[PDB]
């Protein structure tokens, strides 16, 4: 839930 959010947002934000 909130446990997965930070890493998921990190991964989704990647551009290179």
């Amino acid at each position, epitope marked *: *839930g909130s*446990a*997965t959010r*930070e*890493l*998921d947002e*990190l*991964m*989704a*934000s*990647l551009s*290179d």
Partner: antibody
Amino acid sequence: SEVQLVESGGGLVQPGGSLRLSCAASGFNVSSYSIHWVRQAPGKGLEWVAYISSSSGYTYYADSVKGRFTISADTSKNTAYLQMNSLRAEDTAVYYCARTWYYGFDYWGQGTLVTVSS
Amino acid sequence: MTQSPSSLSASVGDRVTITCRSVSSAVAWYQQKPGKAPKLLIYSASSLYSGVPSRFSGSRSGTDFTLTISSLQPEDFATYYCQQFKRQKEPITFGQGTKVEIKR
């Protein structure tokens, strides 16, 4: 033990061949936590290789496997998969799946050995 | 890429601080013993994972992340790994293992 990750589908394959690993999750929903595959060659360190959010569908691969491996999940079987094509000797390792826990992986499967040889 | 773990000799009771060798947002620390899955010690730089002994701690200073074992016991001799998270490829990377062995 309440959360668990159980892997299977490992074993032997030849260079150029393909294998499919499974990661069966219990005690949590795969749509609530992202899942990773991590591997380790005999006597070597841990190498992160792939990531999947089952809910969003977002996937990411390490360049060492990009174009050859596909990560996926079946939320109805609560299972993640790693499809490995065009295998090489250097893909020989113990493959683990592991669950996201903030900045960290909390639960890890037992590992399944993959040996790529002729 | 990847490689064999480096080695550190220590006596039971010693204090050990490992430094995680492109700047990282966060770091996690793992312990692994032969034939076993890695075990999470510290997540998000400094949070002690549930059930890990309090002699294990993690800390950030500037861009340098450390794990400290305040006083080693026999069961702590094992291989340790830092995991870097960063907003750039590769986003998740495990550092070289650090194998803490018993000084005899």
